Amino acid sequence: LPADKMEVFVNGEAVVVPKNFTVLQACDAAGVDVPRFCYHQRLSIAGNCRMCLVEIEKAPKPVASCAFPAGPGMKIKTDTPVIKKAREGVMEFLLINHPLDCPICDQGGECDLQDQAMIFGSDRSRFIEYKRAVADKNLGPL
């Protein structure tokens, strides 16, 4: 822990990170991969998708890793069953209004949504209502 570097615990393993990292940054340093949709390294942090939720012993409710600053001696749990359930619920909310356009989508083999549905989601749905519909508009030749 030389000066700026601190120590954080991710899933019970010691990781030395600078003070300016967030929870997601330390989790990446620990080799743990958190599900993300809106967080991007080179873009401003948003925190809207709420798919990165992890558990901090200090915090009562799950926090978003991308926007949560890491602290000295913080213990981070990314595999607790509550986090698994929260991941599945967020995935359900993401998919309830999604169009059934996988065969006609050009993201078919490269979709984050599908892959994280398979890995961090349930295999079945309970939604029977009408989905939302949007009308597309031209953004240019490309």
């Binding site: 069953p81 698994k84 359930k85 599945e88 349930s122 749905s125 309970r126």
Partner: protein
């Protein structure tokens, strides 16, 4: 089917929840032959048998 309105894969996920533990065995510690042959029958009456498993595991 009780899975229609109750969706939880992490509770029903057996594929990714298997693990391997580690032990070390040494020749110095003697083997327990009491376990192997103490439970072995000495007379026809004491013979105990393991029945064939009727069905393979199913979720129900």
């Amino acid at each position: 089917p009780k899975l229609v309105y109750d969706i939880k894969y992490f509770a029903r996920d057996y594929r990714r929840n298997n693990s391997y533990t580690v032990r070390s065995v040494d020749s110095k510690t003697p083997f327990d032959y009491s376990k192997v042959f103490g439970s072995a029958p000495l007379k026809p009456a004491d013979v105990k048998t393991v029945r064939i498993p009727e069905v393979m595991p199913h979720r129900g």
